[PDB]
Amino acid sequence: HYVDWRMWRDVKRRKMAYEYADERLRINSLRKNTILPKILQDVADEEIAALPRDSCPVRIRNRCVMTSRPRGVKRRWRLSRIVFRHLADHGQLSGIQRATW
Amino acid sequence: EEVVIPKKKTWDKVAVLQALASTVNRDTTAVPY
Amino acid sequence: VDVPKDLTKPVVTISDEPDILYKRLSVLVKGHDKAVLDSYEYFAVLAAKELGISIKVHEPPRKIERFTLLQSVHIYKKHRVQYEMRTLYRCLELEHLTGSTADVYLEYIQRNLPEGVAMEVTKTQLEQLPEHIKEPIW
Amino acid sequence: KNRAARVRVSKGDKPVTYEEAHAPHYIAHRKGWLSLHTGNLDGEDHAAERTVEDVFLRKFMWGTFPGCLADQLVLKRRGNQLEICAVVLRQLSPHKYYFLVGYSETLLSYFYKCPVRLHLQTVPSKVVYKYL
Amino acid sequence: TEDFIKKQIEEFNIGKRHLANMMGEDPETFTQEDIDRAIAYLFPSGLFEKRARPVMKHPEQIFPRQRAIQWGEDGRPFHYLFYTGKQSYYSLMHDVYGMLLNLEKHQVIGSRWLIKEELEEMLVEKLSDLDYMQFIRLLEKLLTSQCGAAEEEFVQRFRRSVTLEEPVQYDEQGMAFSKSEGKRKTAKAEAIVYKHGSGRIKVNGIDYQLYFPITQDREQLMFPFHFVDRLGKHDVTCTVSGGGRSAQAGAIRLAMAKALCSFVTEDEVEWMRQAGLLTTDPRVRERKKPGQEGARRKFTWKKR
Amino acid sequence: HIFLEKHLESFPKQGPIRHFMELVTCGLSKNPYLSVKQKVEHIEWFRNYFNEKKDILKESNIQFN
Amino acid sequence: SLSEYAFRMSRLSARLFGEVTRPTNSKSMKVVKLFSELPLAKKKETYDWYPNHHTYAELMQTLRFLGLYRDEHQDFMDEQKRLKKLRGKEKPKKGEGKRA
Amino acid sequence: RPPRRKALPPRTEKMAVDQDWPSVYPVAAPFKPSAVPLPVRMGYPVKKGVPMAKEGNLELLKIPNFLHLTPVAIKKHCEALKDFCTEWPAALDSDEKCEKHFPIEIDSTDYVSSGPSVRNPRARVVVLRVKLSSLNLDDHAKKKLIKLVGERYCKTTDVLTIKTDRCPLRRQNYDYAVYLLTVLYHESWNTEEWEKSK
Amino acid sequence: AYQVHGLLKTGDNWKFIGPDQHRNFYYSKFFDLICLMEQIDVTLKWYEDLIPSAYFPHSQTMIHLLQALDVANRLEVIPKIWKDSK
């Protein structure tokens, strides 16, 4: 029941990334170093490449949590600029006021 | 010159609330809470 | 005439463990409202005075975080709306109070903390040297 | 022309409450916030979760009291408590009001895992601050 | 209506008694200031508009002084100039004219004229700009004439005070000195000028010639003492913080001038004020506005 | 939480693998967000992976247990 | 660079403070800085970025069916759907696209 | 036609001028116009108007009122809670005596926030502070300890500050701080052979 | 009855007053006895203290209170009582 299919894709990507994060961290730690032999590092590169594509954290997009807008999202509130303005201008966000100085 | 350390008073997690509630009587003008 | 004839009281048990000594409690309350912070300061100061606790008050400088958003839903980049979130502070320093008194006062002032006001209490716990440090094991 | 949260004058007869009358630039000047929680303060956290909770609470309360609400809610948060203060018209019989209060309190408490209280203040009619 | 006002007065009295009970004070001696303080404590509000904060004043102040209908049950208006629609203003004009006639029969510094809004509040009646100008002209003609004490009191009802705007200490060794403070942009300085000295200035514990390499800053430091011909006759210890070199020099200059005002004569103090050595400079950096390059520069209007 | 060297007993006493696991244990000790069970699980996974890869490691003349 | 006394004192301090007792370059120090914090995916803000829209929508729909929540928007949608179905706009069965 | 319910007059009318206010408001509760016997008005008044009355006044409902914390109520609460307090040692009159008798100061923070979750990572930080003068050290041990600690020692204040934040719980960080102080002291009093290369 | 009520008020004995029906019956009988056998001033004090905080009176209890007021000849309260009845 998400806002759009893009939000559904983002949710699936986040879930898969959470599932595979421990293994990705372990393999990356095996890779991002110079102590270990090169052959083992190449094997680790192949193994992390063999992981599902959607498990990569870089594919996660910080869409708005109410309109799926992929840009203008304030990370502190996870809302698009339009929705954040709509809520703040109605006084429904604590402590947020028009800035005049 | 010697310093003494007082004993630690201990109480239940609701002791402060009960102590405060002991100071309020029933509001005559008010219907039950 | 309907006053209770007898009063029930909570149980305060004097344990055998020595109480913790606090040099300073730095209750820093943050809020969006100066009047609310002033009322809370008055309440806390009155409570401390009536509980026999030394207390000092000061006001750290406020922090006004500001940010900017595009106004129109489409284009019109030159037009923006600027919002801010003022954070006003009030630091209460309570000196030389035991652990029991500190716990009671903190519970009293925290249960009555107004909505929209956060609290960060810093406790300075006086301690004695462990036995391993009083004299060298060597 | 600015259009955000403003009630544009049409004929001089449409009634508006105190909150509807005031424009966004009057927030913290002539009208307080409708939700008070420590999320948006300096250094504090979980602002997004509190905002989502507030939006859902407003929608749920508006849809649970159909036409009963006479004004916006006030969502106060003290510790893990959650007080929803509402102004309601005197339309329904008090039996329905009490049923809805118990229902909403229990359901929201079980849904947000926090003790939710609901305080209702009844008014004979929607309070009119001015006419537009 | 009047009965409504009476009911509001009774409600206010009861509420005043209840508030005195709530704050644990004597109801008989609970002044309006105590009421305001109690309301502010019990109902805190950070709203900037003071008129928007909670208020429990007397009904004489909360309700507009336009009062209820200006006629009794019989319908006869109370004031004889009611049908003028401006009975307060025209009654005031009639009284002023009578005063002028009596003056004919018989025969500036710390005050200004109240603005039209103030007069409207005084008479709770809407007035026009030309009406206000006519009344001001009549008042000024009254003042210019040989007004007596009663006329002076009458004018003082409309006079508004103009907003026109030093200690000497001894150290542990009996050196008489004066201490002052000054601000300029973001720099803040605190200066100490001793009554007797041989022209030695220590800025942040450092000599000025080594702390202010620029000749302009040293000239700014020289300006106050040179204006009063007291160069080389006073010792100064000053500490400045924030801002740049010129802002610090200006802050120290202002602080030194204010401190030295404690030693020079009153005429010399007035001369220093007229020279601009005592006025805190309000010129501070202007904020950059959104959609613009700077404080005032707009973005380059695109070529068409 | 901190002294996790006792969990490295199933690793070579000296060698590049020991150095890498020393780095890993230092990182885990610096980590306040993981329970002791998860910190042990990371080291156990590393041990199992190195055991499965003992062929390549021994080809590189780096003994693993 | 420092004298062996200072170098060994620093090494002893690192030993006491739970640092790396053996020399290591920054590239390998990336491993320590990786395990010192939670992975980006594991962070609370990442895996729980969105609210559970399934839970919210299903709960509100169930409440509306139970009659304890008046979804005005859904009532408007249903009224428009009924009017359109009277007009003749209805979804066809699956596998039955008009274009062939 | 079914009868229409008539709202009762507010109970503020039945209140007494010399009643006990804390009975009316024992705990923090929203501003109830039917329960506050004060003619308070809030709201920016319209032109030639008055501030809005309390009945239906959402602005007063927004305010976190302190009607449950009147001075009488505060005094009664403190009188009740006096039984829970323990007297501070009168001997420790000043911070000088506190440092003389208690040379280790432990700093910790508790954060209070609005929400269903009370967890806050910043509460796990522990800061141990101790004056080296208050410790029992010689010249060599002090010199070695200073080099060992590095930036943690401020010679101006002669205070060693050990900050522990790597363990999930505050108690674990406190234990780690105590252990770090112990090992630093013991290594300071321990002399190595290679120290001769100074 | 005063001794019984004092026993009820002592400590947490009030929690043993029972369900709503039992509490209403207890307070009704208590107030009827108070109206019957007490001075009208203390009777009115008890009326203020209990109703409506303790319970909601029944028409018979109001009639008994009216009879007590008539015995005391304090008819000036009679209008207020009617408002209370409303």
Residue found under tokens 């207020």: I80
Measured distance CA(E250)–CA(E149) in Å, rounded:
48
Structure tokens at D6: 């403003």
Selecting from C1, C5, C6 the residue whose C-beta is nearest the C-beta of I42 gives C1
Is residue D53 within 8 Å of D35, Cβ to Cβ?
A: no
Task: Flag if G22 and F22 touch (Cβ within 8 Å).
Answer: yes
Q: At I62, phi and psi to the nearest 5?
A: -65, -40
Residue positions counted in chain A: 101
Measured distance CA(E111)–CA(E109) in Å, rounded:
6
Torsion of CA C90, C94, C100, C105, to 10 degrees: -40
- The distance of I42 to chain C (nearest Cα, Å) reads 8
Integer distance in angstroms from the first to the last C-alpha of chain H? 104
The closest of D115, D121, D118, D17 to D60, measured between CA atoms, is: D118
Residue positions counted in chain D: 132
A65 inside domain? yes
Residue found under tokens 């879930």: A15
Distances (CA, A) of A55 to A9, A16, A33, A52, D96: 12, 5, 22, 6, 51
Task: Flag if F20 and G31 touch (Cβ within 8 Å).
Answer: yes
The closest of C93, H108, C19, C4 to B11, measured between CA atoms, is: C19
Distance of CA E125 to the CA centre of its chain: 26
Contacts of H2 (CB under 8 A, 6+ apart): none
Measured distance CA(H45)–CA(H61) in Å, rounded:
17
3-state SS string for H64-80: CCCCCCCHHHHHHHHHH
Torsion of CA F9, F12, F13, F14, to 10 degrees: -150
Task: Flag if H79 and C99 touch (Cβ within 8 Å).
Answer: no
The closest of H196, H198, H191, H193 to H140, measured between CA atoms, is: H191
Identity at E54, one-letter amino acid code: P
Query: What is the SS3 assignment for C126?
Result: strand
Measured distance CA(E272)–CA(E258) in Å, rounded:
9
Q: Chains meeting B at 3+ CB pairs closer than 8 A?
A: C, H, I
Long-range contacts of E24-31 (CB under 8 A, 24+ apart): E24/H70, E24/H71, E24/H72, E24/H75, E27/H17
Q: Which helix (H) or strand (E) holds C111?
A: helix C99-111
This structure was determined by: cryo-EM
- The distance of D64 to chain H (nearest Cα, Å) reads 20
Measured distance CA(F6)–CA(F19) in Å, rounded:
15
A101 inside domain? no
Q: Which domain holds residue A46?
A: 1-91
- The distance of C7 to chain B (nearest Cα, Å) reads 7
Beta carbon pairs, D and H, within 8 Å = 88
Is residue E258 within 8 Å of E165, Cβ to Cβ?
A: no
In chain F, residues with a C-beta closer than 8 Å to the C-beta of A37 are 16, 56-57, 60, 62
Contacts of E303 (CB under 8 A, 6+ apart): none
Closest chain D residue by Cα to residue E53: D30
Is residue E24 within 8 Å of H74, Cβ to Cβ?
A: no
Q: At E78, phi and psi to the nearest 5?
A: -75, -40
User: Does C138 contact A at CB distance below 8 Å?
Assistant: no
Measured distance CA(D44)–CA(H120) in Å, rounded:
9
Query: What is the SS3 assignment for H105?
Result: strand
Query: What is the SS3 assignment for F34?
Result: coil
Measured distance CA(G6)–CA(H194) in Å, rounded:
10
Residue E228 is classified by DSSP as T
Is residue D15 within 8 Å of A74, Cβ to Cβ?
A: no
Measured distance CA(A17)–CA(A21) in Å, rounded:
6
Structure tokens at C115: 């909505």
User: Does B32 contact I at CB distance below 8 Å?
Assistant: yes
User: Does G20 contact A at CB distance below 8 Å?
Assistant: no
A33 inside domain? yes
Measured distance CA(C129)–CA(H102) in Å, rounded:
8
Q: At E127, phi and psi to the nearest 5?
A: -135, 155
Closest chain D residue by Cα to residue H43: D30
Query: What is the SS3 assignment for D15?
Result: strand
User: Does E83 contact D at CB distance below 8 Å?
Assistant: no
Whether C contacts I, i.e. 3 or more CB pairs less than 8 A apart, is yes
A61 inside domain? yes
Beta carbon pairs, A and D, within 8 Å = 66
In chain H, residues with a C-beta closer than 8 Å to the C-beta of G5 are 194-195, 197-198
Identity at C94, one-letter amino acid code: L
Q: Give the number of C-alpha atoms closer than 13 A to the C-alpha of residue D54, restricted to the C-beta side.
A: 31
Measured distance CA(H176)–CA(H2) in Å, rounded:
74
Measured distance CA(E236)–CA(E257) in Å, rounded:
11
- The distance of B31 to chain C (nearest Cα, Å) reads 16
Task: Flag if B16 and C104 touch (Cβ within 8 Å).
Answer: yes
Measured distance CA(I11)–CA(I15) in Å, rounded:
9
Q: Which of residues 44-103 of D touch C (CB under 8 A)?
A: 44, 76-79, 83
In chain E, residues with a C-beta closer than 8 Å to the C-beta of H39 are 8, 11-12, 15, 56
Measured distance CA(G45)–CA(G50) in Å, rounded:
9
Measured distance CA(E98)–CA(G55) in Å, rounded:
82
Query: What is the SS3 assignment for I57?
Result: coil
Instruction: Please state the domain count of chain A.
Output: 1
Contacts of D48 (CB under 8 A, 6+ apart): A65, A76, A77, A78, A79
Per DSSP bridges, beta strands D116-123 and D82-89 are parallel
A19 inside domain? yes
Distances (CA, A) of I16 to I6, I8, I22: 13, 8, 10
Identity at I51, one-letter amino acid code: I
Torsion of CA C100, C106, C108, C111, to 10 degrees: -140
**H-state helical runs in chain G:** 4-16, 26-35, 44-47, 53-66, 72-87
Whether A contacts D, i.e. 3 or more CB pairs less than 8 A apart, is yes
Measured distance CA(G55)–CA(G51) in Å, rounded:
9
Task: Flag if D28 and A94 touch (Cβ within 8 Å).
Answer: no
**Positive or negative: CA dihedral D18, D19, D23, D26:** positive
Structure tokens at D43: 């250094």
Per DSSP bridges, beta strands E176-184 and E187-194 are antiparallel
**Positive or negative: CA dihedral C12, C14, C15, C19:** positive
Distances (CA, A) of I44 to C1, C71, I68, I77: 10, 66, 10, 10
User: Does H96 contact C at CB distance below 8 Å?
Assistant: no
DSSP per-residue codes, A29-90 = HHHS-SSS-HHHHHHHHHHHHTS-GGG-GGG-----TTT--SSSEETTTTEEHHHHHHHHHT
In chain A, residues with a C-beta closer than 8 Å to the C-beta of F24 are 29
In chain F, residues with a C-beta closer than 8 Å to the C-beta of G33 are 27
Residue E198 is classified by DSSP as -
Based on the number of CB atoms within 10 Å of its own CB, is I23 exposed (0-12), middle (13-18) or buried (19 or more)?
A: middle
Omega into C10 within 30° of 0, i.e. cis?
no
Selecting from A1, A21, A75 the residue whose C-beta is nearest the C-beta of G42 gives A21
Residue D26 is classified by DSSP as G
The closest of E112, H84, A80 to C105, measured between CA atoms, is: H84
A98 inside domain? no
The closest of C89, D41, D65, D6 to A93, measured between CA atoms, is: D41
A97 inside domain? no
Measured distance CA(E274)–CA(E269) in Å, rounded:
9
Measured distance CA(D121)–CA(D75) in Å, rounded:
14
User: Does B20 contact H at CB distance below 8 Å?
Assistant: yes
Structure tokens at C122: 């810093």
Task: Flag if G39 and A57 touch (Cβ within 8 Å).
Answer: yes
Query: What is the SS3 assignment for B7?
Result: strand
Based on the number of CB atoms within 10 Å of its own CB, is E119 exposed (0-12), middle (13-18) or buried (19 or more)?
A: buried
Is residue A65 within 8 Å of A78, Cβ to Cβ?
A: yes
A100 inside domain? no
In chain G, residues with a C-beta closer than 8 Å to the C-beta of H194 are 4-5, 8
Selecting from C112, C119, C123 the residue whose C-beta is nearest the C-beta of H108 gives C123
Q: Give the number of C-alpha atoms closer than 13 A to the C-alpha of residue C48, restricted to the C-beta side.
A: 22
- The distance of H61 to chain D (nearest Cα, Å) reads 7
Structure tokens at H118: 């009370």
